[PDB]
Design an enzyme around this catalytic site. Sequence first.
Site, PDB file in Angstrom:
ATOM      1  N   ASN A 278      -8.496  68.203   6.112  1.00  0.00           N
ATOM      2  CA  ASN A 278      -9.764  68.930   6.207  1.00  0.00           C
ATOM      3  C   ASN A 278      -9.467  70.413   6.053  1.00  0.00           C
ATOM      4  O   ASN A 278      -8.891  71.029   6.955  1.00  0.00           O
ATOM      5  CB  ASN A 278     -10.451  68.651   7.546  1.00  0.00           C
ATOM      6  CG  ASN A 278     -11.781  69.396   7.695  1.00  0.00           C
ATOM      7  OD1 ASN A 278     -11.924  70.519   7.242  1.00  0.00           O
ATOM      8  ND2 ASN A 278     -12.761  68.750   8.325  1.00  0.00           N
TER       9      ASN A 278
ATOM     10  N   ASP B  78     -11.565  73.019   5.668  1.00  0.00           N
ATOM     11  CA  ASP B  78     -12.577  73.959   6.182  1.00  0.00           C
ATOM     12  C   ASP B  78     -12.943  75.050   5.163  1.00  0.00           C
ATOM     13  O   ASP B  78     -13.022  76.239   5.483  1.00  0.00           O
ATOM     14  CB  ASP B  78     -12.118  74.595   7.499  1.00  0.00           C
ATOM     15  CG  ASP B  78     -13.260  75.309   8.235  1.00  0.00           C
ATOM     16  OD1 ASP B  78     -14.378  74.759   8.290  1.00  0.00           O
ATOM     17  OD2 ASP B  78     -13.036  76.441   8.718  1.00  0.00           O
TER      18      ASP B  78
ATOM     19  N   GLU C 135     -14.235  68.789   3.579  1.00  0.00           N
ATOM     20  CA  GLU C 135     -14.879  70.090   3.819  1.00  0.00           C
ATOM     21  C   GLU C 135     -14.450  71.091   2.744  1.00  0.00           C
ATOM     22  O   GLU C 135     -13.993  72.199   3.029  1.00  0.00           O
ATOM     23  CB  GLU C 135     -14.605  70.623   5.240  1.00  0.00           C
ATOM     24  CG  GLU C 135     -15.868  71.060   6.066  1.00  0.00           C
ATOM     25  CD  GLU C 135     -15.589  71.279   7.569  1.00  0.00           C
ATOM     26  OE1 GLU C 135     -15.909  72.343   8.158  1.00  0.00           O
ATOM     27  OE2 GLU C 135     -15.037  70.351   8.188  1.00  0.00           O
TER      28      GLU C 135
ATOM     29  N   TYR D  97     -15.230  62.095   4.764  1.00  0.00           N
ATOM     30  CA  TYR D  97     -15.609  63.109   5.744  1.00  0.00           C
ATOM     31  C   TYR D  97     -16.801  62.527   6.500  1.00  0.00           C
ATOM     32  O   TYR D  97     -17.938  62.635   6.041  1.00  0.00           O
ATOM     33  CB  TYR D  97     -15.961  64.429   5.064  1.00  0.00           C
ATOM     34  CG  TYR D  97     -16.366  65.530   6.012  1.00  0.00           C
ATOM     35  CD1 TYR D  97     -15.631  65.786   7.165  1.00  0.00           C
ATOM     36  CD2 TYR D  97     -17.474  66.334   5.744  1.00  0.00           C
ATOM     37  CE1 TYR D  97     -15.990  66.809   8.034  1.00  0.00           C
ATOM     38  CE2 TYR D  97     -17.850  67.347   6.607  1.00  0.00           C
ATOM     39  CZ  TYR D  97     -17.104  67.583   7.750  1.00  0.00           C
ATOM     40  OH  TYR D  97     -17.467  68.600   8.603  1.00  0.00           O
TER      41      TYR D  97
ATOM     42  N   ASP E 167     -11.116  62.779   7.576  1.00  0.00           N
ATOM     43  CA  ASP E 167     -11.642  63.213   8.867  1.00  0.00           C
ATOM     44  C   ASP E 167     -12.708  62.206   9.288  1.00  0.00           C
ATOM     45  O   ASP E 167     -13.831  62.225   8.783  1.00  0.00           O
ATOM     46  CB  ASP E 167     -12.185  64.632   8.744  1.00  0.00           C
ATOM     47  CG  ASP E 167     -12.743  65.181  10.038  1.00  0.00           C
ATOM     48  OD1 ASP E 167     -12.803  64.482  11.072  1.00  0.00           O
ATOM     49  OD2 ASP E 167     -13.132  66.356  10.008  1.00  0.00           O
TER      50      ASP E 167
ATOM     51  N   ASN F  70     -13.907  61.984  12.332  1.00  0.00           N
ATOM     52  CA  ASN F  70     -14.739  62.640  13.353  1.00  0.00           C
ATOM     53  C   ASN F  70     -14.928  61.786  14.609  1.00  0.00           C
ATOM     54  O   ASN F  70     -16.036  61.635  15.127  1.00  0.00           O
ATOM     55  CB  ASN F  70     -16.086  63.061  12.761  1.00  0.00           C
ATOM     56  CG  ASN F  70     -16.129  64.537  12.437  1.00  0.00           C
ATOM     57  OD1 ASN F  70     -15.674  65.356  13.230  1.00  0.00           O
ATOM     58  ND2 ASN F  70     -16.666  64.887  11.267  1.00  0.00           N
TER      59      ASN F  70
ATOM     60  N   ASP G   1      -8.203  62.919  12.284  1.00  0.00           N
ATOM     61  CA  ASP G   1      -7.817  62.596  10.924  1.00  0.00           C
ATOM     62  C   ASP G   1      -6.810  61.454  10.951  1.00  0.00           C
ATOM     63  O   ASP G   1      -5.816  61.513  11.685  1.00  0.00           O
ATOM     64  CB  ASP G   1      -7.233  63.826  10.237  1.00  0.00           C
ATOM     65  CG  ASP G   1      -8.191  64.999  10.257  1.00  0.00           C
ATOM     66  OD1 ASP G   1      -8.213  65.750  11.255  1.00  0.00           O
ATOM     67  OD2 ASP G   1      -8.942  65.158   9.275  1.00  0.00           O
TER      68      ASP G   1
ATOM     69  N   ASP H 159      -8.636  74.742  10.548  1.00  0.00           N
ATOM     70  CA  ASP H 159      -8.598  74.316  11.946  1.00  0.00           C
ATOM     71  C   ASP H 159      -8.216  72.851  12.100  1.00  0.00           C
ATOM     72  O   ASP H 159      -8.071  72.387  13.236  1.00  0.00           O
ATOM     73  CB  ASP H 159      -9.938  74.577  12.667  1.00  0.00           C
ATOM     74  CG  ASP H 159     -11.134  73.924  11.977  1.00  0.00           C
ATOM     75  OD1 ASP H 159     -10.982  73.309  10.896  1.00  0.00           O
ATOM     76  OD2 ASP H 159     -12.249  74.050  12.526  1.00  0.00           O
ATOM     77  N   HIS H 160      -8.065  72.120  10.995  1.00  0.00           N
ATOM     78  CA  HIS H 160      -7.330  70.866  10.995  1.00  0.00           C
ATOM     79  C   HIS H 160      -5.959  71.096  10.379  1.00  0.00           C
ATOM     80  O   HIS H 160      -5.751  72.033   9.603  1.00  0.00           O
ATOM     81  CB  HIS H 160      -8.046  69.760  10.214  1.00  0.00           C
ATOM     82  CG  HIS H 160      -9.348  69.322  10.814  1.00  0.00           C
ATOM     83  ND1 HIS H 160      -9.599  68.015  11.182  1.00  0.00           N
ATOM     84  CD2 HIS H 160     -10.488  70.006  11.055  1.00  0.00           C
ATOM     85  CE1 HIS H 160     -10.828  67.923  11.653  1.00  0.00           C
ATOM     86  NE2 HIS H 160     -11.387  69.119  11.596  1.00  0.00           N
TER      87      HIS H 160
HETATM   88 MG   LIG Z   1     -15.188  73.203   9.752  1.00  0.00          MG
END
Ligand SMILES: [Mg+2]
Lengths: 275, 275
Positions: free
Chosen positions: A25, A27, A53, A128, A167, A169, A240, A265-266
């Site tokens: 991911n 971001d 993302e 995702y 991801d 989630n 993930d 941030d992943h």
């Molecule tokens: Mg994000």
Amino acid sequence: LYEDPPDQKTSPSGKPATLKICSWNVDGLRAWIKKKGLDWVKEEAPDILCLQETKCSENKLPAELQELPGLSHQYWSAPSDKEGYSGVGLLSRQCPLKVSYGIGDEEHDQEGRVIVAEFDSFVLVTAYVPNAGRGLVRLEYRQRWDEAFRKFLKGLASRKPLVLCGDLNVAHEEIDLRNPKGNKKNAGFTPQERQGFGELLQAVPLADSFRHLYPNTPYAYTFWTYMMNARSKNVGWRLDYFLLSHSLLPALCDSKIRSKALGSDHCPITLYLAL
Amino acid sequence: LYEDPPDQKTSPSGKPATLKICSWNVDGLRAWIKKKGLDWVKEEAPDILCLQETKCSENKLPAELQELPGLSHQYWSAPSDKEGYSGVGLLSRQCPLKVSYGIGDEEHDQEGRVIVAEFDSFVLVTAYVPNAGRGLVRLEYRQRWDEAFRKFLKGLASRKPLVLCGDLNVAHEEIDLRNPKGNKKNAGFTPQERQGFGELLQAVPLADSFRHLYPNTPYAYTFWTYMMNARSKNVGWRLDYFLLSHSLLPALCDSKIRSKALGSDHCPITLYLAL
Ligand SMILES: [Mg+2]
Ligand SMILES: [Mg+2]
């Protein structure tokens, strides 16, 4: 507080890994490219790179992607509307037998979340998964996505061994996040999301590659909120995954969490298969 | 008044043809599909099928295309605006090393006219060349397209042997149309278009596959106006070609004009190469 163990590049029988898949991911594809994300990919040198993302329209992709070494077959899916949201990508050394988009359900195929790439001996899906949202505002929808996604993957797996990555989630169990107690009513650790993840494993069926190899290993996460520098304190979640058809377990060499690779941030995760 | 000779499926040295390419201006993908065009393709069974004048947006393709046997790798390019105009397609049994769109010139890359598909030992281009228009209104532009297209193909050929196919919208010589005298001031047979075709052959360099094999054969055409039923009288033009790098001539088995196949106002052409 977590050190990923060294890469095990052979299968239980001693077959050398032939296939290396990295999932990340990012971001924001452009923001990540800026943070030298593609530099890290070139060092890791996967056969297949799956991104989530991207937040990038399929016709505004950065030129840096044209460059990539043996990742020249590239597939992209983004919301067919506003940009800067969601988006996935799948970049492959070898050309897949076939590439498809979405999960065959129009309501769930509008946010550029799923790419399907079939190969000789397996089918690869990157996802995702929709987050359940602040105040669990999207939890009812997420439960509906979960059931439709499960049905779709069940169908794929019935014809060819399946690798699902990306991801998803949800942190499956208390061991999969630093603060289970405080997050039982937050997106990613609701009983509903955790139950749907369990159903996915039992129903398709799929095995959690990392947890299969490392069933008692705590503090292994792939996401840390940017705030409070949670990453430095390792206050994270494992969101993930690489989930594998049971028939692929003899091909499993290792499932890695690249805790140290920056740019999002992943962090990236990497799978080694001996096919 | 023209009978295409039997298919010569071996090369001068006796190598069996390994690659069969069919090219066809379909005058509207949907209208052609209605006229059983895909039925004819399945009988012909090419390794690669290139289409021109699809007049179809890349996201409104008919479902019948999903079906095609070993033509599952499909590439489409249409004007990034109004539909019902121009459009090309390239459908391949094998996955190409790389696919590109247009000729690297923004002014000339807006009408969905060119697809480039690179393979192991050659690069294939299919083209729908801009016609010069009623009253030669687009002749000045066509001359500019011609020069840019020549420069682009010159570059491709410098790295890999080239096969150019499709509707090049010019009858090269008097032998290439039924009525040269009456068409010297009409789109498709102006001295300017004919000169540009000659430059293309000399400059890249490229050979006219059909004329190379059949240099003295008259009445071989690939387009007949629908009006006055010109097709029944064989009042036609040869507008559709396979042009080959000179280095591919030893691989040339045959270059066919499928005079009898209906569904358009152009007929299909078929190339056999022993690679
Ligand atoms: Mg994000
Ligand atoms: Mg037409």
